[PDB]
Amino acid sequence: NMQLQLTQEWDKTFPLSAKVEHRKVTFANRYGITLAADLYLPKNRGGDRLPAIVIGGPFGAVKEQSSGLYAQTMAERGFVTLAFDPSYTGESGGQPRNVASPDINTEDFSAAVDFISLLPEVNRERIGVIGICGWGGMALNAVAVDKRVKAVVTSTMYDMTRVMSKGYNDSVTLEQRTRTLEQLGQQRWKDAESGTPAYQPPYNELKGGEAQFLVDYHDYYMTPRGYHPRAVNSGNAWTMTTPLSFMNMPILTYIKEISPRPILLIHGERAHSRYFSETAYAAAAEPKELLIVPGASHVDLYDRLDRIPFDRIAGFFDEHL
């Protein structure tokens, strides 16, 4: 219920579609934070209320990036859609800026469902969600307990609690994890002494010697391709102590309780992160499907129309919503 200043400039990383009606909206979550979002609806609508889809992700990205592209595209496919900025980020409220939590972020998804549900153009009983990158994990986490969500799709997902706790491909040992936690403790004291939290070094800046998937992230987040000034991943960062919650509170515990509702996990064949979906798929219960996109990288499923299976995503929700 906080009043937020939302820009009217079309600053999306993709052009506005003439086949959709767009406007910005706001809504609060259960923890008292007001979020900002872009709502897209099909034009020349018939008499029946429409199915709806809430889209979030990547983790550290804003609605003007990938989630927005997905939302507009699916709106062209006949769905009412919404791309939102997670708590403390983008145009959403919350302070300190750029802090995250698996709990609060999981809540953000259901706060978005709360809003899209009350729209006069939507049928609250026909709601689905799409979780991209880091929010793929949050989407599955949200659907497990939010029984209103009828189906869920994840795209090139990450389980952010797993990556922050074990690093990529479980590269963090207990000793290294303990060392990191000890350091975080020292950081809490420094932040407490100044009263304000410090931020991690700028995100996605190449120094040389970085693995290809990191170069890919830079090419998306730090070039005209997908750069947006408000995104954490676009040259900014989370607070140094953000990892404390993620490293201590895993998500997906109740992933099997999404069933009987369907899950479609989508992932590029060559993605460094493909294993996250393989883990989630194994942990999940039927109905479930792991769809591998031949030869696709991680960032390919961010904005590549010839790599993102929108036909399949639309077909999936058409049946289940």
Short mmCIF file of C-alpha atoms in Angstrom, two decimals:
data_model
loop_
_atom_site.label_atom_id
_atom_site.label_comp_id
_atom_site.label_asym_id
_atom_site.label_seq_id
_atom_site.Cartn_x
_atom_site.Cartn_y
_atom_site.Cartn_z
CA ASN A 1 0.00 0.00 0.00
CA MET A 2 3.10 2.17 -0.23
CA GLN A 3 3.06 4.85 -2.93
CA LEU A 4 5.75 4.07 -5.47
CA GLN A 5 7.14 6.24 -8.25
CA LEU A 6 7.02 4.16 -11.43
CA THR A 7 8.64 5.35 -14.66
CA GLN A 8 6.34 5.81 -17.65
CA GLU A 9 9.23 5.65 -20.10
CA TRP A 10 9.30 2.41 -22.07
CA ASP A 11 12.66 1.25 -20.74
CA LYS A 12 12.16 -2.47 -21.41
CA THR A 13 14.86 -4.57 -23.09
CA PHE A 14 12.36 -5.46 -25.82
CA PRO A 15 9.87 -3.43 -27.89
CA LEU A 16 6.28 -2.93 -26.79
CA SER A 17 3.92 -5.25 -28.67
CA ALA A 18 1.03 -3.73 -30.61
CA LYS A 19 -1.02 -6.83 -29.83
CA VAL A 20 -1.09 -6.19 -26.08
CA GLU A 21 -2.40 -3.60 -23.63
CA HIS A 22 0.15 -2.61 -21.01
CA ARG A 23 0.17 -0.69 -17.73
CA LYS A 24 2.14 -0.73 -14.47
CA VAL A 25 0.63 -1.88 -11.18
CA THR A 26 1.56 -2.31 -7.53
CA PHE A 27 0.50 -4.64 -4.71
CA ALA A 28 1.73 -5.63 -1.26
CA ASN A 29 2.95 -8.96 0.09
CA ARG A 30 2.21 -10.52 3.49
CA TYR A 31 5.36 -9.03 4.95
CA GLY A 32 4.26 -5.47 4.24
CA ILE A 33 6.36 -4.76 1.15
CA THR A 34 4.74 -3.13 -1.89
CA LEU A 35 5.91 -4.52 -5.22
CA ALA A 36 5.94 -2.95 -8.68
CA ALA A 37 4.99 -4.89 -11.80
CA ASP A 38 4.07 -4.74 -15.49
CA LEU A 39 0.68 -6.17 -16.43
CA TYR A 40 0.03 -7.35 -20.00
CA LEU A 41 -3.37 -8.30 -21.42
CA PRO A 42 -4.54 -9.54 -24.84
CA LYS A 43 -6.53 -7.01 -26.90
CA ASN A 44 -10.08 -7.50 -28.25
CA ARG A 45 -10.97 -9.99 -25.53
CA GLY A 46 -14.01 -12.25 -25.73
CA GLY A 47 -16.69 -12.72 -23.10
CA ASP A 48 -15.05 -15.25 -20.76
CA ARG A 49 -12.50 -14.38 -18.08
CA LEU A 50 -8.94 -15.27 -19.07
CA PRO A 51 -6.32 -17.67 -17.65
CA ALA A 52 -3.36 -15.83 -16.10
CA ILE A 53 0.37 -16.33 -15.58
CA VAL A 54 2.71 -14.72 -13.05
CA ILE A 55 6.32 -14.53 -14.17
CA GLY A 56 9.41 -13.90 -12.05
CA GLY A 57 13.16 -14.12 -12.54
CA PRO A 58 16.06 -14.14 -13.13
CA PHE A 59 17.31 -13.78 -9.55
CA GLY A 60 18.88 -10.33 -9.47
CA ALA A 61 17.08 -9.20 -12.61
CA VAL A 62 14.18 -6.77 -13.01
CA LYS A 63 10.87 -6.94 -14.87
CA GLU A 64 12.23 -4.92 -17.79
CA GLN A 65 14.53 -7.82 -18.63
CA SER A 66 13.72 -11.50 -19.31
CA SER A 67 10.54 -11.85 -17.21
CA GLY A 68 9.02 -8.92 -19.07
CA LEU A 69 9.87 -10.46 -22.44
CA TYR A 70 8.22 -13.71 -21.31
CA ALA A 71 5.13 -11.91 -19.96
CA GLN A 72 4.53 -9.89 -23.12
CA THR A 73 5.11 -12.91 -25.35
CA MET A 74 2.68 -15.06 -23.38
CA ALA A 75 0.16 -12.20 -23.40
CA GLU A 76 0.34 -12.38 -27.20
CA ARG A 77 -0.47 -16.07 -26.72
CA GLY A 78 -3.80 -15.24 -25.07
CA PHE A 79 -2.88 -15.06 -21.37
CA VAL A 80 -3.16 -12.16 -18.93
CA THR A 81 0.38 -11.78 -17.59
CA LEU A 82 2.40 -10.03 -14.92
CA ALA A 83 6.17 -9.49 -14.54
CA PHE A 84 7.15 -8.13 -11.12
CA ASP A 85 10.14 -6.71 -9.29
CA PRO A 86 11.04 -8.78 -6.20
CA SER A 87 10.96 -7.14 -2.75
CA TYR A 88 13.74 -4.58 -2.16
CA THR A 89 14.61 -4.45 -5.88
CA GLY A 90 13.73 -2.66 -9.11
CA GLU A 91 10.86 -0.23 -8.62
CA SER A 92 9.44 -2.20 -5.69
CA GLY A 93 9.61 -0.86 -2.15
CA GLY A 94 11.70 -2.16 0.72
CA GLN A 95 14.86 -1.10 2.49
CA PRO A 96 17.77 -1.66 2.60
CA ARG A 97 17.76 -1.82 -1.18
CA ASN A 98 18.86 -5.04 -2.86
CA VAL A 99 18.56 -7.57 -0.05
CA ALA A 100 16.97 -11.00 -0.65
CA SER A 101 15.51 -13.99 1.19
CA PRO A 102 14.17 -17.38 0.07
CA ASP A 103 11.19 -16.88 2.38
CA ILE A 104 10.30 -13.33 1.38
CA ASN A 105 10.95 -14.01 -2.30
CA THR A 106 8.79 -17.13 -2.25
CA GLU A 107 6.11 -14.88 -0.72
CA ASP A 108 6.56 -12.31 -3.53
CA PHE A 109 5.32 -14.88 -6.04
CA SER A 110 2.11 -15.49 -4.09
CA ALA A 111 1.69 -11.75 -3.53
CA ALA A 112 1.72 -11.44 -7.32
CA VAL A 113 -0.87 -14.21 -7.62
CA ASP A 114 -2.95 -12.29 -5.06
CA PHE A 115 -3.09 -9.30 -7.41
CA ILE A 116 -3.51 -10.97 -10.78
CA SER A 117 -6.33 -13.02 -9.21
CA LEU A 118 -8.57 -10.06 -8.42
CA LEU A 119 -8.39 -8.56 -11.92
CA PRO A 120 -11.80 -8.32 -13.62
CA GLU A 121 -10.27 -9.77 -16.80
CA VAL A 122 -8.98 -12.92 -15.11
CA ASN A 123 -10.40 -16.18 -13.83
CA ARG A 124 -8.73 -16.69 -10.43
CA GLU A 125 -9.14 -20.47 -10.88
CA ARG A 126 -6.94 -20.47 -14.01
CA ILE A 127 -3.58 -19.23 -12.71
CA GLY A 128 -0.13 -20.57 -13.49
CA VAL A 129 3.41 -19.35 -12.88
CA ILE A 130 6.73 -19.31 -14.71
CA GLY A 131 10.00 -19.20 -12.76
CA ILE A 132 13.10 -18.15 -14.69
CA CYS A 133 16.68 -18.78 -13.59
CA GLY A 134 16.95 -18.31 -9.82
CA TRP A 135 13.21 -17.78 -9.55
CA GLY A 136 12.59 -21.18 -11.06
CA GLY A 137 13.44 -22.51 -7.62
CA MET A 138 11.24 -19.91 -5.93
CA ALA A 139 8.34 -20.74 -8.28
CA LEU A 140 8.41 -24.45 -7.37
CA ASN A 141 8.72 -23.46 -3.71
CA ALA A 142 5.67 -21.18 -3.94
CA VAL A 143 3.46 -23.65 -5.81
CA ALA A 144 4.05 -26.41 -3.25
CA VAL A 145 2.09 -24.50 -0.59
CA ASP A 146 -0.01 -22.05 -2.63
CA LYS A 147 -2.79 -24.39 -3.80
CA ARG A 148 -4.32 -21.66 -5.97
CA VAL A 149 -1.55 -22.04 -8.58
CA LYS A 150 -2.68 -24.73 -11.04
CA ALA A 151 0.52 -25.45 -12.97
CA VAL A 152 4.16 -24.38 -13.01
CA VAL A 153 6.95 -24.07 -15.59
CA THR A 154 10.58 -23.31 -14.77
CA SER A 155 13.09 -22.04 -17.32
CA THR A 156 16.86 -22.63 -17.01
CA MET A 157 16.40 -22.67 -13.22
CA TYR A 158 18.77 -22.37 -10.27
CA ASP A 159 17.92 -23.36 -6.69
CA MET A 160 19.43 -20.25 -5.08
CA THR A 161 19.73 -21.83 -1.61
CA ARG A 162 21.71 -24.72 -3.08
CA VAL A 163 24.05 -22.52 -5.12
CA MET A 164 24.78 -20.17 -2.21
CA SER A 165 25.25 -23.07 0.21
CA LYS A 166 27.23 -25.49 -1.99
CA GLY A 167 28.48 -23.32 -4.86
CA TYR A 168 28.43 -24.59 -8.45
CA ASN A 169 28.34 -28.39 -8.65
CA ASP A 170 28.87 -28.72 -4.89
CA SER A 171 32.30 -27.07 -4.81
CA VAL A 172 32.02 -25.68 -1.28
CA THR A 173 33.33 -27.86 1.54
CA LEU A 174 32.15 -27.51 5.13
CA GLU A 175 35.46 -25.80 5.91
CA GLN A 176 34.93 -23.27 3.14
CA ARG A 177 31.26 -22.80 4.09
CA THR A 178 32.25 -22.24 7.72
CA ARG A 179 34.91 -19.75 6.63
CA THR A 180 32.31 -17.83 4.61
CA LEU A 181 29.87 -17.76 7.53
CA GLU A 182 32.59 -16.55 9.89
CA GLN A 183 33.31 -13.71 7.46
CA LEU A 184 29.62 -12.84 7.18
CA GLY A 185 29.54 -12.55 10.97
CA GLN A 186 32.38 -10.02 10.82
CA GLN A 187 30.46 -8.13 8.13
CA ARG A 188 27.35 -7.92 10.32
CA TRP A 189 29.46 -6.07 12.91
CA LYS A 190 30.85 -3.62 10.33
CA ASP A 191 27.35 -2.95 8.98
CA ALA A 192 26.03 -2.54 12.53
CA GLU A 193 28.78 -0.05 13.37
CA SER A 194 27.80 2.17 10.42
CA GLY A 195 24.11 1.34 10.70
CA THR A 196 23.90 0.56 6.98
CA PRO A 197 24.81 -2.66 5.12
CA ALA A 198 27.69 -2.73 2.65
CA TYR A 199 27.19 -4.08 -0.88
CA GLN A 200 29.14 -6.80 -2.66
CA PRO A 201 31.49 -5.78 -5.51
CA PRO A 202 29.74 -4.85 -8.81
CA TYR A 203 28.12 -7.82 -10.56
CA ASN A 204 29.10 -9.26 -13.95
CA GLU A 205 32.28 -7.28 -14.55
CA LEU A 206 34.88 -9.31 -16.43
CA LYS A 207 38.50 -9.33 -15.27
CA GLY A 208 39.62 -12.10 -17.60
CA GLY A 209 39.84 -15.84 -17.08
CA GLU A 210 36.14 -16.24 -16.32
CA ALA A 211 34.30 -19.36 -17.48
CA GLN A 212 32.12 -19.00 -20.57
CA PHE A 213 28.85 -18.99 -18.63
CA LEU A 214 30.12 -15.90 -16.79
CA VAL A 215 31.06 -14.25 -20.08
CA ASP A 216 27.54 -15.09 -21.25
CA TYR A 217 26.02 -13.37 -18.21
CA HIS A 218 28.10 -10.27 -18.88
CA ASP A 219 27.09 -10.21 -22.54
CA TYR A 220 23.47 -10.15 -21.45
CA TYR A 221 23.48 -8.00 -18.31
CA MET A 222 26.23 -5.56 -19.28
CA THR A 223 25.61 -4.78 -22.95
CA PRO A 224 22.59 -3.27 -24.72
CA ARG A 225 21.30 -6.85 -25.12
CA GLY A 226 19.80 -7.04 -21.63
CA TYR A 227 21.26 -4.23 -19.55
CA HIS A 228 18.98 -2.32 -17.20
CA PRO A 229 20.25 0.20 -14.61
CA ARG A 230 18.02 -1.01 -11.77
CA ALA A 231 19.06 -4.68 -11.97
CA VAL A 232 21.38 -6.15 -9.35
CA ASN A 233 23.03 -8.23 -12.05
CA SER A 234 23.58 -5.18 -14.26
CA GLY A 235 26.59 -3.72 -12.46
CA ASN A 236 25.11 -3.54 -8.98
CA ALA A 237 24.86 -6.12 -6.18
CA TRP A 238 23.11 -7.60 -3.18
CA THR A 239 24.11 -6.58 0.33
CA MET A 240 27.16 -8.50 1.54
CA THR A 241 25.07 -10.29 4.17
CA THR A 242 22.24 -11.43 1.84
CA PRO A 243 23.55 -15.04 1.68
CA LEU A 244 22.85 -15.68 5.39
CA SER A 245 19.19 -16.62 4.81
CA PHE A 246 19.77 -18.65 1.63
CA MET A 247 22.65 -20.58 3.20
CA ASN A 248 20.41 -21.54 6.14
CA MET A 249 16.87 -22.02 4.78
CA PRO A 250 16.46 -24.45 1.87
CA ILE A 251 13.57 -24.27 -0.56
CA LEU A 252 11.79 -27.14 -2.37
CA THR A 253 11.31 -29.24 0.76
CA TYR A 254 7.70 -29.90 -0.22
CA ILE A 255 8.20 -30.09 -3.99
CA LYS A 256 6.39 -33.44 -4.17
CA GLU A 257 3.25 -31.71 -2.90
CA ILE A 258 2.87 -29.81 -6.14
CA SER A 259 1.41 -33.07 -7.46
CA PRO A 260 -1.30 -33.81 -8.65
CA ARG A 261 -0.62 -30.43 -10.31
CA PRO A 262 1.83 -30.56 -13.30
CA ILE A 263 5.43 -29.34 -13.53
CA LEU A 264 7.37 -28.64 -16.73
CA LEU A 265 11.05 -27.87 -16.18
CA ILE A 266 12.74 -26.46 -19.29
CA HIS A 267 16.53 -26.28 -19.71
CA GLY A 268 19.21 -25.82 -22.35
CA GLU A 269 21.31 -28.89 -23.16
CA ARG A 270 24.61 -27.01 -22.88
CA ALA A 271 23.67 -24.93 -19.83
CA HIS A 272 26.15 -25.02 -16.94
CA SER A 273 23.05 -24.94 -14.75
CA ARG A 274 21.20 -27.84 -16.34
CA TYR A 275 21.90 -29.98 -13.29
CA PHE A 276 19.62 -27.81 -11.12
CA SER A 277 16.58 -28.91 -13.14
CA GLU A 278 17.78 -32.51 -13.10
CA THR A 279 17.90 -32.38 -9.30
CA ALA A 280 14.47 -30.74 -9.08
CA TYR A 281 13.00 -33.19 -11.59
CA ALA A 282 14.29 -36.17 -9.60
CA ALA A 283 12.94 -34.66 -6.38
CA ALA A 284 9.51 -33.92 -7.86
CA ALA A 285 6.56 -36.29 -8.33
CA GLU A 286 4.41 -36.99 -11.40
CA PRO A 287 2.97 -35.26 -13.27
CA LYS A 288 6.39 -33.87 -14.21
CA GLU A 289 8.49 -33.34 -17.32
CA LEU A 290 12.07 -32.32 -17.93
CA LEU A 291 12.33 -30.72 -21.37
CA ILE A 292 15.86 -30.30 -22.71
CA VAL A 293 16.45 -27.74 -25.48
CA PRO A 294 19.16 -29.12 -27.79
CA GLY A 295 22.34 -27.05 -27.93
CA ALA A 296 21.01 -24.21 -25.78
CA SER A 297 23.09 -22.39 -23.17
CA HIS A 298 21.80 -20.79 -19.97
CA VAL A 299 21.42 -17.23 -21.24
CA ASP A 300 19.87 -18.59 -24.45
CA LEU A 301 16.60 -19.12 -22.57
CA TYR A 302 16.65 -15.50 -21.39
CA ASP A 303 15.80 -13.82 -24.69
CA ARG A 304 16.36 -16.14 -27.66
CA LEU A 305 12.98 -16.64 -29.34
CA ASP A 306 14.32 -19.56 -31.36
CA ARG A 307 15.58 -21.22 -28.17
CA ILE A 308 12.73 -20.47 -25.74
CA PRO A 309 9.90 -22.99 -26.39
CA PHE A 310 6.97 -20.57 -26.15
CA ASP A 311 4.69 -22.82 -28.23
CA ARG A 312 5.20 -25.58 -25.64
CA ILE A 313 4.86 -23.20 -22.72
CA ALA A 314 1.60 -21.78 -24.10
CA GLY A 315 0.36 -25.26 -24.98
CA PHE A 316 1.23 -26.41 -21.46
CA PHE A 317 -0.80 -23.68 -19.76
CA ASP A 318 -3.61 -23.87 -22.33
CA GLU A 319 -4.25 -27.42 -21.19
CA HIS A 320 -3.65 -27.02 -17.47
CA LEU A 321 -5.23 -23.61 -16.92
#
